[PDB]
Amino acid sequence: PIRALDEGDIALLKTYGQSTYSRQIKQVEDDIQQLLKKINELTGIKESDTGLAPPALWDLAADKQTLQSEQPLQVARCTKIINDPKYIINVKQFAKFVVDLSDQVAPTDIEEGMRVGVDRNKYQIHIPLPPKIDPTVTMMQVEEKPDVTYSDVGGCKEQIEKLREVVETPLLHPERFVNLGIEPPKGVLLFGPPGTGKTLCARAVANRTDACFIRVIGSELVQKYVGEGARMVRELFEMARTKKACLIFFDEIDAIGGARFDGGDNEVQRTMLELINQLDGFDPRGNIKVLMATNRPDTLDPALMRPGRLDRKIEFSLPDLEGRTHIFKIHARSMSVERDIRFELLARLCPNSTGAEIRSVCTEAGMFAIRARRKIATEKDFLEAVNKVIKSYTPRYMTYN
Amino acid sequence: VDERPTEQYSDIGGLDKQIQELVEAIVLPMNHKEKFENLGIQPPKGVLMYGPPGTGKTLLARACAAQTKATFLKLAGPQLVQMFIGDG
């Protein structure tokens, strides 16, 4: 029995009511939106910054002189030298050319396998170039020590000692191992529950690594083009070999080191196979201690987990009571806490909680102390934080006693 | 292979049948030849070393490379995969 609306009904509904100010307000809103759009269009620039130096820095009219005189040179590698000598040059992907040197360079300068520049017209070799240093692989280095030391890692004395015996002791004091004929393990696989502190130990090692520390970004190794990830792994391991006693950290190794299956991952599997032979196989790896971490060790290919590539498998178990107390002290060193805080009770109230949950509890206690305007967080704040962080995420406890 | 890695067969343990098989199928036909042609028994063209990971396949390959005057030409599966079509 419902009846549809007509034109007169619509008109009366939109008129029979409030019309003394509704029309004016609606028009004002529409025109305010229009004015905002007009202003945005009028400015609508946000001039994007470009690398233009200060006016005095360049102030050069000879830049045109160098542009007109100097000529761009394609970079290519001389695969072979022919004997007037002729040179076979691979212009990356363009084509293969058989060119001869320009008078500027001497024949002795150009050697087989060296990447040299060539003119865009005749392809003559004009100048040698330093061997390629990959930009992503080079940026994969640390060159900035994180500010987390071994004193910030608590409850893992045995694990930390094993990690040092793997990545630090063999580098600092090779004599203790050479005298007894002991080859120190070259790799460590830090596997444990998430938030237990593997990455913290890795950061501590990088902090006191006193060598080349390379953090392997799982994103770069997985590349869009086929064969690019294996090339990146091969470049990273070469850059590690050129240095002395390098340290490679394969964070979240389960990102690429999945179990092979029969297209599936395929390309990532090829990159994994490239890392496997680099770590172990022909052509000994050298002084490159590999550090791998993963919260899910069961998905790794058995080849990558075999004790020839990851020699020492450190298990980062949930901290025991002493470990939890030490973690609480470490994370509460800066907190303005009262002097009677029984950290033992807070440790015993977090039965199975990693270091990350302990830090969360400490931050929650601080936030509770901030809620009520108190600058000192009493033990009651810590108890409430423990309830909120662990217990939050009676009849069941009734049976127990 | 130009560094000629050193690994005597004594370093390989638990695989006496497999080491002999590889030597007779990859080495004996190599430096003898005319003898095999005498008996008219075709030597296998290749050896596929398959087994559980870490069994020592690459170790036997290294031992063969070290204790063989042949020109070992190592390579990896990932190495023969390149973006440019036909590069592999």
Added chain:
Amino acid sequence: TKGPDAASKLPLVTPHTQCRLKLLKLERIKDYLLMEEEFIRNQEQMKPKQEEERSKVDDLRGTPMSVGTLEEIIDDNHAIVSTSVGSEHYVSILSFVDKDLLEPGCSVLLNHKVHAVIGVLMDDTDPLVTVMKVEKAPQETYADIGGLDNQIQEIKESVELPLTHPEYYEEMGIKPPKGVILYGPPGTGKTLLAKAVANQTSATFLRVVGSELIQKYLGDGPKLVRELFRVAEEHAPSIVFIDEIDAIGTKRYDSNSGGEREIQRTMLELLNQLDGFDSRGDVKVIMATNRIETLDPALIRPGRIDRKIEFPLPDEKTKKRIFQIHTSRMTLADDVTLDDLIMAKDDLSGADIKAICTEAGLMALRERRMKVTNEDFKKSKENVLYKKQEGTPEGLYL
């Protein structure tokens, strides 16, 4: 530095009801808008050196200018730049380019003919990422949420208070929670609390769906996540909102599929950016999921998501607050006793305590009434509550 690119928003008008005070407020805002328009329109027109330098630079640069990647820096006036097609060119670095920014991996701007480097592209942000940035802040403020007080307090302490009053955290010695997860039944107020935070917040707000982070190509996913977090870091104070996290945050499991293993890789890149080697910086992540039991434990562990805010189905007081919020505009009648519908059994959510309002309005329109009545609300409830089939046991328990 590149400080926050906070979203722009006009001031709020309090009257709401079409009273002349609201008209005056809107007229004042329009007056200031016309003020700005006239000022900036006269500036260039009323306007009548560096022109020589600009002309010289642009004549040396020429057009069009190719955007390429800098591979290496050989000398102070030479570098190897690889054009977009993958071909490397040994081009000459011109004087008018700050050598400080020229670093490997940067997007260099090159002359089209000689390929000589002429400038360094600063932003070069992935277009699929620059879209995420919130420019027009949503109009839904905190007053537009009924209840969810505890939740509002937690979200404020996580993403809002730290910027405004960092003194408390600095003195207490605790780093403010830098990650919050909003989980609960559907239609509870998760995306709302996100919209309100984006409206009130002064930091750059980035919105993602949890499905746009996945790209068809293999390495595009992790690289997109890295680009998003790099853009967030570029604007120091930032809030990144990854709604529908359960799209890519599913529990990691041995998958015989590159699709699944690619999604797992995207999740791994996300959790590496959130809390891994290198600090995350001053970027706060807010995530919403109507399913938190299916998320990878690593993603929702303390350190990445530090406050697992729960969003329950509204209770009686909260339901009354959502009826007051969504009926304030409506011209209610005298006999509308909302408590009758507010009672409910246990399962009335905001969406419903709003669709119910919309349905009551429509039923009032059916009878040609712009003022709703109790019968309209009861009919609207009966019509719009038909969501769950049984969801209940039989008459077993006593």
Added chain:
Amino acid sequence: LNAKVRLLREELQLLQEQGSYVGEVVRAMDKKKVLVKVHPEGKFVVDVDKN
């Protein structure tokens, strides 16, 4: 007849002009240069016509 002939001649003249590229636009830069992404090639910072 003259109008028809002129139309055909103009069509022939315009046909000889080179076809223009088509590429997406990333963002305006300085109110006179626009960053664009041609299909097969890479990015380009191009100027804008008067109209």
